Amino acid sequence: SMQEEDTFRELRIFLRNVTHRLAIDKRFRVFTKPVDPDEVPDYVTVIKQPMDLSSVISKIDLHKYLTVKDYLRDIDLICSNALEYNPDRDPGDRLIRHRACALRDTAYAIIKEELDEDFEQLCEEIQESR
Ligand SMILES: CC(=O)N[C@@H](C)C(=O)NCC#CBr
Ligand SMILES: [Cl-]
């Protein structure tokens, strides 16, 4: 229905706003673009589903997220990819892991404060209906 299309459009507006707020944070610059294969040619071999915030924006606009849970799966991938690819004790790896965990925690904290639970439940019930 048009009511359902309005619902998903509101979801995309909300997700674009959350994603923009993460992308402008200087801590998260490394996560705004895909890893460059030049610098890191073993990346695309270790990490089977690369994810970054530009990929997330593209997915929002392709109507790939019908719930906030589906969006958070991709935010969690940004974090888990960084924990897997950069697991060492040296400062460069610890800094990337801390920034990745912080991205993920920031996204979850914005959604806790600003997502109405009944809105998410409506999205889930339309998605389940299709
Ligand atoms: C996202 C990720 O895991 N990237 C690894 C390869 C990394 O060491 N990044 C440093 C930088 C920059 Br900007
Ligand atoms: Cl830096």
Side-chain angles (χ1 to χ4, degrees):
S1 69
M2 72 102 155
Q3 304 93 76
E4 286 171 352
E5 291 321 300
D6 286 351
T7 298
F8 291 132
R9 191 160 177 268
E10 176 162 358
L11 173 67
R12 293 192 299 268
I13 294 164
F14 174 74
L15 295 179
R16 293 192 196 90
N17 178 262
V18 175
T19 308
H20 183 252
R21 288 152 66 191
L22 298 175
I24 69 182
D25 192 308
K26 20 141 98 154
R27 292 174 291 173
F28 307 148
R29 198 189 155 76
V30 57
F31 305 122
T32 58
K33 281 173 66 150
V35 175
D36 193 344
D38 299 352
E39 276 69 4
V40 207
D42 61 285
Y43 189 77
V44 83
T45 81
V46 171
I47 299 300
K48 297 310 182 190
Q49 3 171 215
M51 190 52 61
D52 68 281
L53 299 170
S54 68
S55 293
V56 170
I57 292 302
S58 287
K59 292 182 64 167
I60 294 167
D61 295 338
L62 288 170
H63 304 191
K64 303 294 196 175
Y65 305 121
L66 298 196
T67 65
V68 179
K69 181 172 305 210
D70 288 349
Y71 171 85
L72 289 171
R73 266 191 255 291
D74 278 350
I75 297 302
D76 283 324
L77 255 192
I78 297 178
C79 177
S80 63
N81 287 343
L83 302 188
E84 172 180 355
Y85 192 76
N86 302 277
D88 291 350
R89 67 90 41 208
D90 61 273
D93 283 14
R94 283 184 170 176
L95 178 61
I96 299 155
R97 292 200 305 277
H98 193 264
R99 289 168 164 179
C101 284
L103 171 72
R104 177 202 58 205
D105 294 345
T106 297
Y108 275 80
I110 291 168
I111 286 155
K112 177 180 194 78
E113 281 207 309
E114 301 180 26
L115 172 59
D116 190 307
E117 289 196 341
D118 286 340
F119 180 87
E120 177 60 359
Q121 184 70 33
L122 175 63
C123 288
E124 288 186 16
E125 296 184 355
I126 305 166
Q127 175 192 52
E128 168 65 293
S129 80
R130 259 146 216 212

